[PDB]
Design a protein around this ligand. Sequence first.
Ligand SMILES: NC(=O)c1ccc[n+]([C@@H]2O[C@H](COP(=O)([O-])OP(=O)([O-])OC[C@H]3O[C@@H](n4cnc5c(N)[nH+]cnc54)[C@H](O)[C@@H]3O)[C@@H](O)[C@H]2O)c1
Ligand SMILES: NC(=O)c1ccc[n+]([C@@H]2O[C@H](COP(=O)([O-])OP(=O)([O-])OC[C@H]3O[C@@H](n4cnc5c(N)[nH+]cnc54)[C@H](O)[C@@H]3O)[C@@H](O)[C@H]2O)c1
Ligand SMILES: OCc1c(F)c(F)c(F)c(F)c1F
Ligand SMILES: OCc1c(F)c(F)c(F)c(F)c1F
Ligand SMILES: [Zn+2]
Ligand SMILES: [Zn+2]
Ligand SMILES: [Zn+2]
Ligand SMILES: [Zn+2]
Lengths: 374, 374
Amino acid sequence: STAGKVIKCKAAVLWEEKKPFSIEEVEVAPPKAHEVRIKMVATGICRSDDHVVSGTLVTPLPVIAGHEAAGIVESIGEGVTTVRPGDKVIPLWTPQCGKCRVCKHPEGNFCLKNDLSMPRGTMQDGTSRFTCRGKPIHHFLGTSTFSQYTVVDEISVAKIDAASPLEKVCLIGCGFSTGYGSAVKVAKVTQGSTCAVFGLGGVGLSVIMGCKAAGAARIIGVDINKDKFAKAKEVGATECVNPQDYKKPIQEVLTEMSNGGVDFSFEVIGRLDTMVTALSCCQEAYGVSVIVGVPPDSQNLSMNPMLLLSGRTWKGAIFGGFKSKDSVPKLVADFMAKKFALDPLITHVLPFEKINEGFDLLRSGESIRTILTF
Amino acid sequence: STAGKVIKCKAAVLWEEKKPFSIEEVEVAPPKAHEVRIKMVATGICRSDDHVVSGTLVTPLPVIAGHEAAGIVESIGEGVTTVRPGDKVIPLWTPQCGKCRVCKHPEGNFCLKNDLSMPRGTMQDGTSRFTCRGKPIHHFLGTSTFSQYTVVDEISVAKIDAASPLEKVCLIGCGFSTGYGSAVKVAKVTQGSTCAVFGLGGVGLSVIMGCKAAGAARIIGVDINKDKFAKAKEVGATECVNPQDYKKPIQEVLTEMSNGGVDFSFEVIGRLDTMVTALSCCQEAYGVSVIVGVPPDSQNLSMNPMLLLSGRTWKGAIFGGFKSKDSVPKLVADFMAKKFALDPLITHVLPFEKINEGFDLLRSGESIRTILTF
Ligand SMILES: NC(=O)c1ccc[n+]([C@@H]2O[C@H](COP(=O)([O-])OP(=O)([O-])OC[C@H]3O[C@@H](n4cnc5c(N)[nH+]cnc54)[C@H](O)[C@@H]3O)[C@@H](O)[C@H]2O)c1
Ligand SMILES: NC(=O)c1ccc[n+]([C@@H]2O[C@H](COP(=O)([O-])OP(=O)([O-])OC[C@H]3O[C@@H](n4cnc5c(N)[nH+]cnc54)[C@H](O)[C@@H]3O)[C@@H](O)[C@H]2O)c1
Ligand SMILES: OCc1c(F)c(F)c(F)c(F)c1F
Ligand SMILES: OCc1c(F)c(F)c(F)c(F)c1F
Ligand SMILES: [Zn+2]
Ligand SMILES: [Zn+2]
Ligand SMILES: [Zn+2]
Ligand SMILES: [Zn+2]
């Protein structure tokens, strides 16, 4: 067997920003204590993976990216108790150590063991399990799912239902859970409310799904790409608007359409200007705006704090506010019981070897989620 | 009798920015339909009144300022049903019309009839009840309490307990209710939590009172004036820190003191820089920061939205989040029932004729609240 041995396999290595991935052989070390080595089955292309390529997100290079995925445990290191070889699993790019002050807090989920705030591109122990051309290669968010095999810390993996369709439930590893939780858990959308969702990609569609599940009466989708509107309406948008169609700024348009401002707004793009526009369009006394989009590295927004003094609430969240290891298995169980749908998010399927075509589809505006199969 | 007649009385007129009040005779018209004329008994000096003088707040001049006050109804216009001549009352600088979407919302209090967002300096009907030297004089926030008599709209006055000591409960008209509500209602401070309060004036002390009432374990007061610390500890601060004493930025100091960030922070000054510092010092995953201080007119702050993406909540509020006409009588009843103290806020009691000396005490750092007695 492969247990305890280096695995040679193919991965998509990013050597340089603004370049295609290189599909080539890597060496994947065996798992150390409290680590898990996973044979990947499916991985989604999230815009955050593209942010690594574009330098919107800064993480050390060279790197194996990928964070939205599902696979099967190949082997476990010493002392692992929560998964076994042959288990279906979803890697957790937001870990859940269960021990830090955030993991112990009833409403926190941004575990202090994350590799997001101050990215090292390593395992928890500060080292890498990947070699390529004899060179160490960085991890990404402790997951590195753009590889036939990855190694993750135990706090960065959840066991899921053995009957799970991995080519669908990989989306619970990022885009679905993030958008759905941003609506239902972070914003706490109320029955009969009016919501505005800026950005109608996979995450924004999942926000719409959550707003509809919460009983919103109106869900206004906002996108500069009108090709996104049909699917947004299919999953619950009641109106869609394209800011490019209007002479006035879209915050003014949305305030007029909502007879004085929306109850809940969501920024699901990653632009400083739309973060401020989304805040402005929620009602000034009781509105809530949630930032979901990832902003460009190290850039600050400018805003008038009178927008908050009148009573608005502004918040953001990682991974929909979900405590990742507790929540992922429950979300898979709910998917299996048909409590929500994932197919509306999946527009394209490709083999892993066609990863660059999958990124081209995202960048052209044509796809929502492309799922890559190993 | 005065009812139905013009009253000539003394008031403090502000003819231009950055000049002393002029204490002189004005004419006060009788109340029209749905208006109430009040003989003032006591009014507090709030920093927001000083903001009118300093140009921090823009409102039409000339003006009779004052918004934190209590008095006795002299007469009512046709159609008034909520107060009668002889009633003790507190003017409401945030009205409660009861009809607008904000008044009908369970968590809104910034009634759309307010004169804050787009100040007109008038009664609801767009006219003034004040003349001085033959010139019309603007109202301020529908209240204009720096006058022996004022006229307010019915939606801008609350009837209070007939046995109320007006030289104390005038503080329920602004500073106490604002700070206390910002803690208990807006932030929803939890038992055992750690709070940081930036600014230890009358409003910040009231925030501390609310944090202590909510059962906070630690309440860290922050002020550049160490003379403010003794009273802050008297009303519940467990520690006080002066940013000037430190080589590091105070957000770093407060993060260290709180072993990774506070649960709740409050900006109770009115500076863009301390609004961002207060947000930063709350724990990145689950912290809450409330803006209470009034920012300088038309100035934007700069901030990194990653502070929110990790999970922080940022909000602001007017008047502690309290629906004004519902809440003010209950707060007075609570004071009468010894549920909270007001004396710790009152450092000076002066005749109304010494209004300018009262403002000088505030500006010098020497007072918390001066109460002016008519
Ligand atoms: N907070 C989290 O945990 C988290 C998780 C997953 C994704 N993200 C971020 O969320 C964002 C969306 O991800 P995704 O859905 O995969 O991306 P996506 O598929 O690229 O969708 C973004 C959408 O925004 C639209 N858009 C671009 N500019 C504008 C504009 N000015 N106004 C309106 N619409 C515009 C665009 O046409 C597209 O449909 C990205 O920034 C991700 O990095 C955050
Ligand atoms: N949101 C509302 O409804 C509302 C109500 C009442 C007051 N306010 C505002 O709240 C603020 C405080 O009012 P107040 O308590 O009457 O004022 P105040 O009595 O002038 O108190 C302000 C305190 O801030 C301190 N301070 C000044 N600069 C700094 C600094 N850099 N760091 C730390 N401390 C500093 C100062 O020494 C003083 O003790 C003002 O901006 C008011 O306009 C808002
Ligand atoms: O898509 C999820 C996602 C994020 F929300 C980030 F904030 C981030 F930095 C990142 F790398 C990521 F993958
Ligand atoms: O002190 C209360 C108070 C405020 F909170 C304001 F925002 C404002 F503009 C104002 F005039 C005022 F008096
Ligand atoms: Zn993602
Ligand atoms: Zn943790
Ligand atoms: Zn109203
Ligand atoms: Zn005030």
